Write a protein that binds this DNA or RNA. Structure first.
Ligand code: MG
Ligand code: MG
Ligand code: MG
Ligand code: MG
Ligand code: MG
Ligand code: MG
Ligand code: MG
Ligand code: MG
Ligand code: MG
Ligand code: MG
Ligand code: MG
Ligand code: MG
Ligand code: MG
Lengths: 271, 114, 88, 70, 101
RNA sequence: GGAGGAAGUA
RNA sequence: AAUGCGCAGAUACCGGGAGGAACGCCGAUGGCGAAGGCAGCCACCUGGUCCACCCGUGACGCUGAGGCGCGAAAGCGUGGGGAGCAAACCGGAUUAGAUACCCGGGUAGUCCACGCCCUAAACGAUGCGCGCUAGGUCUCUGGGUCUCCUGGGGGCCGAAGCUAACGCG
């Protein structure tokens, strides 16, 4: 589900590109309340917070709906499968019989014109969103509210899924793409299905621009820096990480459970 | 956990030992004994004699709570099989069920080279 | 799959005189139905390499009667090829 | 110790429900009795197990009754 | 458009409201799939051998129908969801066979 | 009678 | 026996839950396919063969160099899955030593989708097709008013004949 090329150049011997055998012939985003303005790659003091970021391309945001609890009992029709450059998945422009138009992450096996509805009484066909106290066990499900009525904050990149392992009181057991089993409320809205574009990990960027075209600048490595900048200030030659593998600010990056320990959320997890 | 009189037993006879235990009609266990807890070790653990001695240690501390008649659910295939039953069929606690639940599969889990 | 109507509808449209249930004209146009119907099977079940063999038998079987017609009567050959569009 | 087969009358062996016509095809544990114990024929047994297994799915028949007194 | 036999087992610990709520969930389904309802052998509860959903009792149902094959296996998809239902099996019209004739 | 599916060491 | 596990609560138990592979009896000496191979149940699609009906075509048949397709297990590439088993690796023990058989762990792999190698004790070490040459005997599968006749298969002794024999029949 990718498009390799022929080696008329270097780079484009191995580069692969994604599947558009499912995007609705389209290009234009219905410039309603959807497209917004953009920004850049540091902070509010002008000091690079996350390093090795910038450049890239002009992108336009697409207002995605994660709060699928404001259109309960008001069905909707999937209209179109669109590209979004701000997420690994694609998006879906879907039409509501109300006359409204909105956006949802694109799940698997999602067809066009296919009824899709939010609500506790909605069916299990992929696309529909509802609380988890209602979604049965062993169900592929994505876009989860961690806490009720905050928005989908779990499982929403390409190909990601999540099962349902069983109910416990007003709380539900969830398996995330990581591998944690977390207590989440049962009244947290999640949509059913597995996110689309499960082939994103299979792509190949082939060259160096495709790094730069995606904002991700080139990543210099510590063994080349000077001990003013990095611990591993590889002085003479490719001398080694003179113990022990670490980060520009000093903390080792080899197996340091950096997660907080005296944290309330730890009560709700089983790693 | 509670001091009762009715109960249930349990036997597990490996090719090399015969660990046995006992409990109540519920599931809460109280006592157990083995070819080691009798005192033997090594390949002597699989000697039916030793196995016959294991149920004895089990036969006691049950009575040390006040049992009367118990149930016997065997689970295994070795040679400490009957030597616990005969040890348990005649010990002081009459039986009401000579059950066998030896775990026989349906050819699912491929075994070691043995 | 195959119904009765799928049979005689073809047959009477080829039975070169009524009563003809099986002639080299009919045989082909009765295999050629299954072939054209069986090939669109092996399109989805592309891994059924166990049914793919009988087709080559079915095809190669049909390979021979056309070699009988074209041998004996030229005139009935292409006059049957044009009816179903066969062999290219 | 005899067999069965003729013990029963006109029973539809393709009927995956008349359990009272089957629970004596099961030995004292659930294991289907073999042809050598049911007088059946070749075809007769095959058609039977396919229903025995069927009937075993609807919750009617067991797979392993525990073995009492050996 | 062939004749199949459907089989439906159901929880017992429920009232004839639910117990009849679900029965229509069956009925107004075969219509949505186009089944010629021929009979029904609502034999009823049976005390199962082994437990299913750790319950040994189940309300049995039955439905010999004549539905198309071009819409069959997708059916139990609509059936095997209702967690009140936890045992479904569909079997072709096995036409009867002689024994001890 | 033929046929099918328990040894320590140079 | 030891490595190993185990006072930090195991081995055995009861309740709950997760996750994978593979289907006990039936099951056999049986069936199916060209071979490789194929074993829970249900269903959708699908190939091959066989029996009777006295209907049709009327030699259209057989083999088949080259070609094309399939092809156990192992191995490979890319993504997964991974309960059990387990090459390589480590330790325990036997030993004259043990780079092994016995044991404690254990990665790849065995599982799934796609695309490759295409190899063999691929063996019935028996190419396919047809005709004729005694029988007896259990069995799988059709048919026919039936411990009877007939068609297709798998086993078992054996007529004549063949072989160096074993043996085939
Ligand atoms: Mg380049
Ligand atoms: Mg920054
Ligand atoms: Mg860059
Ligand atoms: Mg870079
Ligand atoms: Mg670098
Ligand atoms: Mg430098
Ligand atoms: Mg192992
Ligand atoms: Mg039937
Ligand atoms: Mg019958
Ligand atoms: Mg211990
Ligand atoms: Mg390796
Ligand atoms: Mg390769
Ligand atoms: Mg002659």
């Amino acid at each position: 589900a990718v498009k390799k090329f022929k080696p008329y150049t270097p780079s484009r011997r191995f580069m692969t590109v994604a599947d558009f055998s499912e995007i609705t012939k389209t290009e234009p985003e219905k410039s309603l309340v959807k497209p917004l303005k953009k920004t850049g790659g540091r902070n509010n003091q002008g000091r690079i917070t996350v390093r090795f970021r910038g450049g890239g391309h002009k992108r336009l945001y697409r207002i995605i709906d994660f709060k699928r609890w404001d259109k309960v009992g008001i069905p909707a029709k999937v209209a179109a499968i669109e590209y979004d450059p701000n997420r690994s998945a694609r998006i879906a422009l879907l039409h509501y019989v109300d006359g409204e138009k909105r956006y949802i992450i694109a799940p698997d096996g999602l067809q066009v014109g296919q009824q899709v509805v939010a609500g506790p009484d909605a069916p299990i066909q992929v696309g529909n969103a509802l609380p988890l106290r209602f979604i049965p066990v062993g169900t592929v499900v994505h876009a989860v509210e961690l806490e009720p009525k905050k928005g989908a904050k779990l499982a929403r990149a390409a190909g990601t899924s999540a099962q349902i392992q069983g109910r416990e009181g007003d709380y539900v057991i969830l398996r995330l793409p990581s591998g944690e089993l977390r207590k989440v409320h049962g009244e947290c809205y999640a949509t059913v299905g597995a996110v689309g574009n499960a082939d994103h990990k299979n792509i190949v960027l082939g060259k160096a621009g495709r790094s730069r075209w995606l904002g991700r600048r080139p990543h210099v490595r510590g063994a080349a820096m000077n001990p003013v900048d990095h611990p591993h200030g590889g002085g003479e030659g490719r001398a080694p990480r003179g113990r022990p593998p670490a980060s520009p600010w000093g903390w080792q990056t080899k197996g340091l459970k950096t997660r907080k320990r005296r944290k309330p959320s730890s009560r709700f997890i089983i790693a | 956990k509670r001091q009762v009189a009715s109960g249930r037993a349990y036997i597990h006879a490996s090719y090399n030992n015969t660990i046995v235990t006992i409990t109540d009609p519920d599931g809460n266990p109280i006592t157990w004994s083995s070819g080691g807890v009798i005192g033997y070790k090594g390949s002597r653990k699989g000697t039916p004699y030793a196995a016959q001695l294991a149920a004895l240690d089990a036969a006691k501390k049950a009575m040390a709570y006040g049992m009367q008649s118990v149930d016997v659910i065997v689970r295994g295939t070795g040679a400490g099989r009957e030597q616990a039953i005969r040890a348990l069929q005649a010990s002081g606690l009459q039986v009401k069920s000579i059950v066998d639940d030896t775990p026989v599969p349906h050819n699912g889990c491929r075994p070691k080279k043995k | 799959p195959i119904t009765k109507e799928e049979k005689q509808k073809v047959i009477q449209e080829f039975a070169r005189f009524p009563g003809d249930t099986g002639s080299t004209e009919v045989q082909v146009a009765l295999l050629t139905l299954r072939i054209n119907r069986l090939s669109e099977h092996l399109k989805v079940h592309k891994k059924d390499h166990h049914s793919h063999r009988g087709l080559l038998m079915m095809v190669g079987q049909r390979r021979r009667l056309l070699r009988y017609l074209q041998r004996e009567d030229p005139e009935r050959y292409r006059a049957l090829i044009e009816k179903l569009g066969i062999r290219g | 110790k005899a067999k069965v087969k003729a013990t029963l009358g006109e029973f539809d062996l393709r009927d995956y429900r008349n359990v009272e016509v089957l629970k004596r095809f099961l030995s004292e544990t659930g294991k289907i009795l073999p042809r050598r114990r049911t007088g059946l024929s070749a075809k007769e047994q095959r058609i039977l197990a396919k229903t025995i297994k069927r009937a075993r799915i609807l919750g009617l028949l067991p797979f392993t009754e525990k073995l009492v007194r050996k | 458009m062939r004749r199949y036999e459907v089989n439906i087992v159901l929880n017992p610990n429920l009232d004839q409201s639910q117990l009849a709520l679900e029965k229509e969930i069956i009925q107004r389904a075969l219509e949505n799939y186009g089944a010629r309802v021929e009979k029904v052998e609502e034999l009823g509860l049976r005390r199962l051998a082994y437990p299913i959903a750790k319950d040994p009792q189940g309300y049995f149902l039955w439905y010999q129908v004549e539905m198309p094959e071009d819409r069959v296996n997708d059916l139990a998809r609509e059936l095997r969801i209702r967690d009140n239902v936890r045992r479904v099996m569909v079997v072709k019209s096995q036409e009867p066979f002689l024994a001890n004739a």
